[PDB]
Each structure stands twice: as C-alpha cells, then as structure tokens.
Design a protein around this ligand. Structure first.
Ligand SMILES: COc1cc(Nc2ncc(F)c(Nc3ccc4c(n3)NC(=O)C(C)(C)O4)n2)cc(OC)c1OC
Length: 262
C-alpha cells in the first residue's frame, strides 16, 4: 500500500477541466471541501513516477497530496497552481513584469533545482513549459514533465520528434550524455525564456539548425530586459565543457547576489 498517501476518492470534488490528452486528464478540484488540488487521471510507469514524487518535497516543487490506486482510472492529486503554466504566464503582456519579478522567478526554479541536485535527482526536461505559477506569482517545478501521461507516452514524451533540443547541451545532442551539467544548461535556457517573456529559444531556427549551431558554439543572445550581471549567470550555464558549468548551489548564490545589487 501507499499508506498515508492513499486518498479516499470520496473526499474529492471535480470542478473545471484543466487539460486533456490521448493518455489522461487533469481537472481542478477540492479535497475535503478545503484545499485546492489538481487531479490527474490516467499505467505501471505512471505509478513508479508517483513513488518518486513521494520522496521529493520542497517549497518550490509541485507537491503530491496523495494517490487513489484501487479504482480505475487511477488518480494523482497534487497542489493547485492557480496561474497555470509558466510559459503561458510569461506571454501575458498584461502582467507587465518588472525585472525584479523575473529574477525572483529564476530564484524559485533555482531553489527547486538545488534540492534536486542535493538529492542526486536529474530532471531532464527543465523548461518554462514544465513549471507552474501559483495564485501568488511563486514559481514551482514539476518533478516530471506535465505532458507525461496526458498528451504523450513514457515512450513518446522526450523521445525523437518530441525531444527538448532547445533546452540541451552539445554533449546530449551528439552523444546522449546526461548528467547534472545538462540540467544546468537547461536552467540557463529557461532563464533566457523568462527574461525574454516566453520567446522560443533560437526562435528563428529548426531543431536541426539549433543542433548544428549549438555544436558550433553559437549561444542565445542577452534578452533586452537582462542586465550584464544577469546574462553572465545564464551564459555561465552554456560553457561547452560540462565541468566548467556551475552547480545550482553556486548559481543560486549568484542570483541572490544580483538581486541584492539590482
Ligand atoms: C488555471 O489554468 C491552469 C491551471 C493549471 N494548474 C495546475 N496546477 C497543478 C497541476 F498539477 C496542474 N497540472 C496540469 C494541468 C493541465 C495539464 C497538465 N497538467 N498536463 C498536460 O499535459 C496539459 C498541459 C495538457 O494539461 N495544473 C495548469 C494549467 O495549464 C498547465 C492551466 O491552464 C490550463
């Protein structure tokens, strides 16, 4: 059993649909009439991913509340993030963000990633599409890709035509070399995403052309809203030599520094 994670489906109310795919559905709801939750309905892999989430718990990670593993379809119940997808949130020109708010959003993710790093857990799809924002503009990482078991397979999300090329270091594109230094690279690219208000990295290129140009040491430009100090930080993430890239411990201390200066 999952002991204290086993949720009684009776304590749930369904209210709004949030998203829907071939493989699953996420609905907004209430649990014991009190707390806001997202309810993700779907198999064995999906459960192995929930067990993972059971062992990860951080202020800036989307928290698992419980599971219902006794009726089909099986449920996962997580915390509810009222301002939705960070990518989409960034694209709303009506928010009229100040640089300070952008760096805070970098700090949030960064704190998340340092926990994961300290747990020797490698994320593999850190991007703006995979973060969420709560009612209070606080940003939180989804341990696993949101897409997983909604739109794509465990076989299809992050394989082939759905591979996160734009968030990937040269060693991954050429050699399938994953390590904590690839998560560092992608954090960098996500910083760029934030400072550019949700522009697609290498916005004028294909995945192939991005793969060639990365391999030739082409990098993303400093977004207008990004100061030199801030750009230095995300750039430091794209060193061609993986071991030359900072840790998340280092970077967070870098982000805190900028934040005190600016
Ligand atoms: C208030 O409006 C919105 C709220 C949320 N909040 C929220 N909080 C916690 C969650 F675990 C959560 N999960 C979730 C939701 C939807 C999904 C998926 N996951 N997965 C998917 O493959 C697609 C992406 C298909 O649909 N959403 C998300 C929104 O989109 C992410 C949104 O805009 C619809």
């Amino acid at each position: 059993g999952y002991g204290s994670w086993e949720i009684d489906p009776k304590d749930l109310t369904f209210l709004k649909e949030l998203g829907t795919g071939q493989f699953g559905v996420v609905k907004y709801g209430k649990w014991r009439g009190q707390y806001d939750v997202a309810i993700k309905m779907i198999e064995d892999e999906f459960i192995e991913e929930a067990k993972v989430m059971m062992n990860l718990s951080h202020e800036k990670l989307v928290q698992l509340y419980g599971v219902c593993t006794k009726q089909r379809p099986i449920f996962i119940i997580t915390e509810y993030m009222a301002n939705g997808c960070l990518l989409n949130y960034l694209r709303e020109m009506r928010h009229r963000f100040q640089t300070q708010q952008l760096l805070e959003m970098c700090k949030d993710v960064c704190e998340a990633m340092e926990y994961l790093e300290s747990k020797q857990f490698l994320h593999r799809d850190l991007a703006a599409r995979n973060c969420l924002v709560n009612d209070q503009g606080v940003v939180k990482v989804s341990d696993f890709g949101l897409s997983r078991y909604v739109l794509d397979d465990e076989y299809t999300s992050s394989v082939g035509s759905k591979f996160p090329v734009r968030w990937s270091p040269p060693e991954v594109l050429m050699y399938s070399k994953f390590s904590s230094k690839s998560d560092i690279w992608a954090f960098g690219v996500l910083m760029w995403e934030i400072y550019s208000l949700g522009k697609m990295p290498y916005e004028r290129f294909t995945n192939s052309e991005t793969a060639e140009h990365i391999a030739q040491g082409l990098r993303l430009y400093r977004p207008h809203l990004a100061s030199e100090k801030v750009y230095t930080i995300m750039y430091s993430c794209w060193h061609e030599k993986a071991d030359e890239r900072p840790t998340f411990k280092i970077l967070l201390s870098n982000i805190l520094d900028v934040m005190d200066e600016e």
